[PDB]
Amino acid sequence: MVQQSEVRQMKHSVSTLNQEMTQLNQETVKITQQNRLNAKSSSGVYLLPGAKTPARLESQIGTLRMSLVNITPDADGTTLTLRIQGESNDPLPAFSGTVEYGQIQGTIDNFQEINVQNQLINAPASVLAPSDVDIPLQLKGISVDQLGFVRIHDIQPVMQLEHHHHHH
């Protein structure tokens, strides 16, 4: 019932608004957008190519932190360096992940993920502590200038053995 006949007819009458705050650095704005969307995400973390900031994700192998650097155009899509940094002090075993990437045409109040598809980021077995890895993420179809968001999710260990949870 919010559908009211509300008109924007510019009438010549003075109206004093509240003291609107100052402007902000463009990158910092995209960072503020990243953080807000990050919390609004239930499937992994939002890495906005315009923010390039590191995001913390609690995976099956452990708590890791990804970020986007060296973002450059590709033959088909866009090549950027996907860095997996360990938040813990432990080495991270071999794992694969499903990364979504597309465009955001809406606002923070209401945004639609359009032109979005995914790719498999498979990193090697990190036998070093602390664990830090960098792998080339060759995005397809989408152009660097047209990049809206790169969301890392679905992180799973590959072909590695478990330890028998002997409780009985």
UniProtKB/Swiss-Prot annotation:
How is this protein named in the record?
Answer: Uncharacterized lipoprotein YajI
Q: Which Pfam families match?
A: DUF3251
What topology does it adopt in the membrane? Lipid-anchor
Q: Does the keyword DNA-binding apply?
A: no
Keywords in alphabetical order, please.
Cell membrane, Lipoprotein, Membrane, Palmitate, Signal
Q: Which GO terms describe its cellular component?
A: plasma membrane
* Organism whose genome encodes this protein: Escherichia coli (strain K12)
Q: Keyword check for Cell membrane, yes or no.
A: yes
Entry's localization field: Cell membrane
